DNA sequence: ACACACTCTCCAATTCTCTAA
DNA sequence: TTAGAGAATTGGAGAGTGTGTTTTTTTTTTTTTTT
């Protein structure tokens, strides 16, 4: 495909959980204690306070770059934490030219979204005897 | 192997894409005038063929196109043959 | 194992030289 | 005077090898036990 879909999507998508009145899991709040490592991949609803939150900072979703010899774009897409930037224009025009041009980031035609950390604790009131409360972290991007 | 270079020749010249688009051009591209410096006009003729050197052959810097084409003009014969065509059509 | 620094090797691109038409 | 056949010199493509990385105050705000 010639560049990524992520690139041209203006929208945001999330689901909703089940009506408990209607109601299964994610209908039924769970305190910070509960939330084991079963349920790793699936969706939950936990109730607790809020402890910490973050200010707004960008994060990158595609990445643009233009080569200087050549006249050509090129795109990149990031999931993990961390990355490795393109150094070498690797089209096959470019190459077949053999014309060994310089890459160069732009942000003016990248994609960010906005991010936030924020971190829940449970109530203390619901604390057993003897024990210090736990805590999840929480991430937030789109609207 | 390893993959075999590329190189200017004389077939990229004599292609549509070559040399007869400076000849089909060149009359409506350049223009002097009295009404401009010496260093004025001398600066126009060479945006032309500098412009028409990157489209045909981006690989090497403009003064290597030039001394580059000095070989293969001198020595190809076909490209001679063409020539000596142009010549008699003026001749013509 | 994943980016780097450094070493080694082969192959063909290039220019130089000699010969004859 | 052109050109084409053969020899010598050089470049860098690219393949290979080895390597490194995780990890006693001194000053100042606040709670607590001690005279
Ligand atoms: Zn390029």
Redesign the pocket.
């Known amino acids: 495909e010639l560049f990524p879909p992520n690139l041209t999507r203006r929208y945001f998508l999330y689901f909703k959980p089940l009506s408990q009145n209607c109601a299964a899991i994610s209908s039924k709040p769970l305190s910070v204690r509960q939330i084991k490592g079963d349920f790793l991949g699936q969706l939950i609803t936990v109730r607790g306070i809020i402890t910490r939150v973050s200010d707004v900072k960008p994060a990158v979703e595609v990445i643009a770059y233009t080569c200087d010899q050549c006249g050509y774009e090129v795109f990149q897409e990031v999931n993990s934490r961390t990355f490795?930037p393109l150094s070498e224009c690797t089209s096959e025009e470019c190459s077949q030219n053999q014309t060994?041009g310089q890459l160069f980031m732009s942000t003016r035609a990248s994609k960010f979204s906005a991010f936030q950390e924020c971190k829940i604790q449970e109530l203390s009131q619901q604390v057993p005897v003897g024990h210090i409360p736990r805590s999840l972290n929480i991430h937030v991007n789109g609207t | 192997?390893?993959?075999?270079?590329v190189?200017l020749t004389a077939e990229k010249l004599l292609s549509d894409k070559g040399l007869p688009y400076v000849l089909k051009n060149a009359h409506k591209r350049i223009r002097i005038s009295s009404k401009k410096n010496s260093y004025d006009n001398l600066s126009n003729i060479i945006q032309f063929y500098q412009l028409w050197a990157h489209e045909l052959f981006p690989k090497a810097k403009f003064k290597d196109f030039m001394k580059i084409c000095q070989?293969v003009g001198?020595?190809d014969?076909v490209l001679?043959e063409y020539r000596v065509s142009l010549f008699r059509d003026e001749m013509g």
């Open positions: 490795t060994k | 192997k390893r993959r075999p270079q190189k070989t001198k020595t014969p001679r």
